[PDB]
A paper describes a structure:
Initially, we chemoenzymatically synthetized a P-selectin glycoprotein ligand 1 ([name]-1)-like bis-T glycopeptide (hereafter P1 and defined by the sequence TEAQT**T**PPPA in which ** denotes a Galβ1-3GalNAc disaccharide) based on [name] substrate cleavage consensus motif determined by a previous mass spectrometry study. The truncated AM0627E326A (P71-E506) enzyme construct produced better diffracting orthorhombic crystals (space group P212121) in the presence of P1 and ZnCl2. The crystal structure of AM0627E326A was solved at 1.9 Å using zinc single-wavelength anomalous dispersion (Zn-SAD; see the “Methods” section). The model obtained from SHELXE26 allowed us to solve the structure of the AM0627E326A–P1–[name]+ complex at a higher resolution (1.5 Å) by molecular replacement using PHASER27. The AM0627E326A crystal structure revealed two distinct domains formed by an Ig-like fold domain and the M60-like catalytic domain. In addition, a water molecule did not coordinate the zinc ion and therefore did not replace the role of the P1 Thr5 carbonyl group in coordinating the metal. However interestingly, in our structure, we observed the presence of a potential catalytic water molecule, further discussed below, which was visualized in the active site establishing hydrogen bonds with the Thr5 carbonyl group, the acetamide NH group of the GalNAc located at G1, and the NH group of Thr6. The Glu2 side chain makes a hydrogen bond with the Asp292 side chain, the Ala3 methyl group establishes CH–π interactions with the side chains of Trp149/Phe290, and Gln4 forms hydrogen bonds with Arg291 (both side chain and backbone). Regarding the two glycosylated Thr residues (Thr5 and Thr6 in Fig. 3a), the Thr5 backbone forms a hydrogen bond with the Tyr470 side chain, the Thr5 methyl group forms a CH–π interaction with the Tyr287 side chain and the Thr6 backbone makes a hydrogen bond with the Tyr287 side chain. Additional enzyme–substrate interactions involve the two contiguous T O-glycans (bis-T) of P1.
Author numbering:
A (entry chain H): 1 to 8
B (entry chain A): -3 to 0, 71 to 506
Amino acid sequence: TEAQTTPP
Amino acid sequence: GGGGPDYLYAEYRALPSPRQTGKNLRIGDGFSKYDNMTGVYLEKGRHVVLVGKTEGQEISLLLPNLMRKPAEGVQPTKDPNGWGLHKKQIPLKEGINIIDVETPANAYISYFTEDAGKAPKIPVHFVTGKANGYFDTTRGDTNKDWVRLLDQAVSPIMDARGKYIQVAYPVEFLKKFTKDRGTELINAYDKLIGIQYQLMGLDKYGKIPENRVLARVNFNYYMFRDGDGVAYLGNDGTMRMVTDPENVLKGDACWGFSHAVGHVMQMRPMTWGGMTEVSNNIFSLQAAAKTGNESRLKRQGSYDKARKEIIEGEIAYLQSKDVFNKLVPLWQLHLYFTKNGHPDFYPDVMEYLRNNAGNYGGNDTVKYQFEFVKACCDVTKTDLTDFFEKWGFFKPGKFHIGDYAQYDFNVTPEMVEETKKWIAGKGYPKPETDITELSE
Ligand SMILES: *[C@H]1O[C@H](CO)[C@H](O)[C@H](O[C@@H]2O[C@H](CO)[C@H](O)[C@H](O)[C@H]2O)[C@H]1NC(C)=O
Ligand SMILES: *[C@H]1O[C@H](CO)[C@H](O)[C@H](O[C@@H]2O[C@H](CO)[C@H](O)[C@H](O)[C@H]2O)[C@H]1NC(C)=O
Ligand SMILES: [Zn+2]
């Protein structure tokens, strides 16, 4: 994968 | 057509290479590899797939494990299988194809070409498949069709598309949260992508992609973007946010969906090291503005916070430790120019960078910070030296940034002087007011 997130 | 049952028999048109579409927009891999959805479900066992005349074209079968879950007792983010969409990819040949399916899967045709207009339509007949169907607003489907598809589904996954969006979500969640409102959901998704295409200038410059963006369920993490598109956790909490068509256009659900798609659409020339969680939120703010949502920069008092950290702190933009502070100047440019007679500001800046920006990776990506400054000035014929100076764009030094990858930028005095002299040489007027003082 090459995952860009958000950590809420 | 007419070669067999609906979905089991269909004729597939070649789509443009998703990788090439991304490369031309400077966005990299993110369009749907699964766009040629079949509406066919293949149970475990031996299958027969008939393929018509290929004229030697490359065509393959994708069988993604969309229902892949962490093993018992495995914490979903600690999954050894990772967060990616696992699939079997089987090359297809003209005539009879014998395919062993180990894990039941929805079928997707992979038919991509470099001359999309001049590739044959290829019949594919899943003579041993089950018709799950799919929902397609562009075909004329209504909520009556949506309800029937969910009620008649043979797969845990329902496929759906609109003009821009492809969706692969569990029937369970679609029934629970979308209920009868399939048209409203797909239209909401299309609206949110279209807002980004408009801000990118794709409508203005005739570059709206044919390729769709896939929103998939996953069983590992809340919300993310990867090379396959955007992914949303298959739990009640997250599916309530994104599969209810009212919820996905409100507040944090609208922000999260827009942010994830914004990662697909953020261009390399606006996404140098340290910008990965910055440049996509221009799309999030524009989506909020177009959906009746309040500005997150306004709600967080980010204008004052950013001016305190960067301008009053007299630090480099590259030294900012807050992705919302780094977003503030990007959004000030939009709010200032769109209300002072340049309504196509970002559409034109992004087209300018597509046509004019360099090709940089790793530590060289800092050159894009200066190409971005030049684009903003040239598009608006405005001398923005003072604005970019105040926001710390022109501070020379060696800057270390952690942004997924590690970056070591070397901004030399020569690099800063070359950019400032390029701007000065244009002889453009300076803004009458201090754009850094703009707040909502
Ligand atoms: C990514 O999407 C998330 C969707 O829930 C979320 O909006 C996140 O931003 C976070 O928002 C939280 C409030 O909903 C907190 O304010 C948190 O501090 C913040 O990071 C999105 N991330 C970004 C960077 O936009
Ligand atoms: C989402 O989770 C990601 C890990 O899977 C990652 O922690 C990401 O946070 C980003 O991490 C970078 C460091 O490599 C930068 O510090 C970036 O600014 C930071 O946001 C998570 N997203 C967010 C918005 O925190
Ligand atoms: Zn993000």
